[PDB]
Each structure stands twice: as C-alpha cells, then as structure tokens.
Design a protein around this nucleic acid. Sequence first.
RNA 1: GGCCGAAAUCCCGAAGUAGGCC
Length: 175
Amino acid sequence: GSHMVEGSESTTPFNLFIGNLNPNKSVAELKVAISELFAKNDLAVVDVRTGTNRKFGYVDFESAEDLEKALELTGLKVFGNEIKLEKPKGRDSKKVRAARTLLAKNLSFNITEDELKEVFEDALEIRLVSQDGKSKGIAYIEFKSEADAEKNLEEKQGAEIDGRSVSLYYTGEKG
RNA sequence: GGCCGAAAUCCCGAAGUAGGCC
C-alpha cells in the first residue's frame, strides 16, 4: 500500500503497540488474527503493522471506544501467540536509540535493572539481555544522549558488584 | 519481470526494511 495521509504520521487517531506476534507465521496473518478477534469483539481495527520479524507489532483503531477495548484486547493470541499491548513508543527507528544507548556486560543472575538503575542514575532506560528465556549477563542502558551514555559508560565501566565487574558495550556501528 | 524475506546481544514501527533468490 503506497498511500499516505495528513495529521502527522498515523492512519487514525487511536493507535497502539503490541508484542509477541509470531516469528513462525506471516505479517498479514498476525494482523488478521487481531482483525478477526476485533470483528468478534465488536471493535473496528483501522490498521495493524508488525514488530519486525513478527516479534512485536502495531495496531490502529477508529475511536476511543476501540482504544479502550483495544486495551482489554491485550489477551490476543496471535495465531497461538498471546500478544502484549500498551501505548506505542514511536520515537527512534528501534535501531536508532542504540546510538544514544549502551548495554552492560559480564553481569550475573542476581543483578537486575534496579541495580543498573542504582549504578546508572543518569541512564533513562535499561533492558536486561538474557538468552530469550534465561539470564545471560548483559543489560542494555539508554542515556539522555551519546555523550551522556558515553560519559556514564566510561564513568563506571566495571561497577564492582555481585563480586564481579560489569562491562559496558555501547550500541553503534563502530562501537 | 516476479518473488523471498533475514538481521540488528537486549529492546517494542527495526520492516514487511536490508539483502538476497529465480
């Protein structure tokens, strides 16, 4: 579909983000499962997208009544994958935030975002990196900017905790 | 002239994008 509209960058006033789509299915299949469930729910999905690779995804409604039901619609099993839902975070092109972000490495099974939040008081967001279902030892951390994530990343780099030092791996192309 | 379709260590328009495949 090569059609665009005005207002800003959306097809409707009520939109939303979803997670857990289906990496073993199709994109239209993910949106159709949510479009069919809304047809039975009594909604009116105006549009739906995906979370690149069917990992997460998006949706769009035509009213505040579809957005409120769309909230309760977080119990959607996309082709057998209970998708998650919540306000959209459209800001950086997913791989764009990495520039102003840095992830910690060499962490442990006990450490956590809280501990990173205690060491990275300047970082605004953090994302623990495990093995898709099992603590791995890394933790992403985004700051107010590159110089911010860089000044803190270098300012700590190591943080003696859990009887172990946590390294910090930025997120760019040159690293 | 069709199609095919992965990644980006976590993470929520990456993308239905890149690269690739006939």
